[PDB]
A paper describes a structure:
One of these effectors is Plenty Of SH3s (POSH), a scaffold protein that mediates c-Jun N-terminal kinase (JNK) activation in apoptosis. Rac1 recognizes Cdc42/Rac1-interactive binding (CRIB) motifs within its effectors through a hydrophobic surface that emerges upon switch I loop closure, ensuring that only the active, GTP-bound form can engage effectors with high affinity. To delineate the interaction site of Rac1, we measured 15N R1ρ relaxation rates of POSH in the absence and presence of a 45% molar ratio of Rac1 and determined the chemical shift differences between the free and bound state of POSH using 15N chemical exchange saturation transfer (CEST) experiments.
To verify that the fusion construct does not alter the bound conformation of POSH, we also determined the crystal structure of Rac1 in complex with an unfused MRE1 peptide of POSH at 1.85 Å resolution. To produce the effector-binding capable form of Rac1, we exchanged GDP for a non-hydrolysable GTP analog, GMPPNP. At the N-terminus of POSH, the partial CRIB motif (326ISPP329) within MRE1 occupies a narrow hydrophobic cavity on Rac1. Specifically, the side chains of I326 and P329 engage with this cavity, while the extended conformation of the partial CRIB motif is stabilized by multiple hydrogen bonds between the backbone of POSH and the side chains of Rac1, including Y23, D47, K166, D170 and R174. Beyond the partial CRIB motif, MRE1 extends into a short, anti-parallel β-strand, augmenting the central β-sheet core of Rac1, followed by an α-helix that loops back onto the β-strand. The switch I loop of Rac1 assumes a closed conformation, stabilized by hydrogen bonds between the third phosphate of GMPPNP and both the backbone amide of T35 and the side chain hydroxyl group of Y32. This closed conformation of switch I allows the binding of the MRE1 helix on top of the loop.
Residue numbers in the entry:
A (entry chain A): 0 to 177
B (entry chain C): 323 to 344
Write the structure that this text describes.
Amino acid sequence: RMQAIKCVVVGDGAVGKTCLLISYTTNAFPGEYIPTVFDNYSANVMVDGKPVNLGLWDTAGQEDYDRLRPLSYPQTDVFLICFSLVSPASFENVRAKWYPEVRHHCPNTPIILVGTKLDLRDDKDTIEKLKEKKLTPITYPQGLAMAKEIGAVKYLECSALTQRGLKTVFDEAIRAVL
Amino acid sequence: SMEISPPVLISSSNPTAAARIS
Ligand SMILES: Nc1nc2c(ncn2[C@@H]2O[C@H](COP(=O)(O)OP(=O)(O)NP(=O)(O)O)[C@@H](O)[C@H]2O)c(=O)[nH]1
Ligand SMILES: [Mg+2]
């Protein structure tokens, strides 16, 4: 049977988990935000000339799905823990929620920490809106330190919108398994 | 040192993505 990888994507609502998956697998970007309960993407990649099936599992960022979400975790090979680079609350939830939940169910599964919406970090309006609430975007060093703190294999930054660093996220997930 | 190709979507439960297949 063709070699297969199950990758599960978790993180707060609105961080960009669904756009990450749509943009990576089809190069499209959806025009309207519809909250995810569960969704799936089956895609083939060539890894050193051999086909690999990527089973990508999308999950709900909302607290109301906390009891169902872990039921999708069995047989996971790698987790993507996602936070938005322009949402400090979503960053803090990596330590307060996502890392503890993933580790409770899957103590030995590799984690990639993913900073999303890279395109917004330099956006003056986004910066000013954060600044008005005494906040600042998450910097690369901050993300890196959080990755070290939670034992993540790798810290990566990307934009689903521009596709900057997007392919690298999934390539690194593959490398964490194969 | 790994050569990884872009993905080819085979299937999805997601309406937006499934529409862009094959
Ligand atoms: N500027 C920018 N906006 C993005 C990016 N990725 C997602 N967004 C926007 O952020 C919002 C939420 O994205 P989405 O992928 O639906 O988030 P989610 O993490 O899947 N949410 P949920 O857990 O509820 O399913 C949408 O308005 C989407 O267009 C990105 O790379 N850049
Ligand atoms: Mg979603």
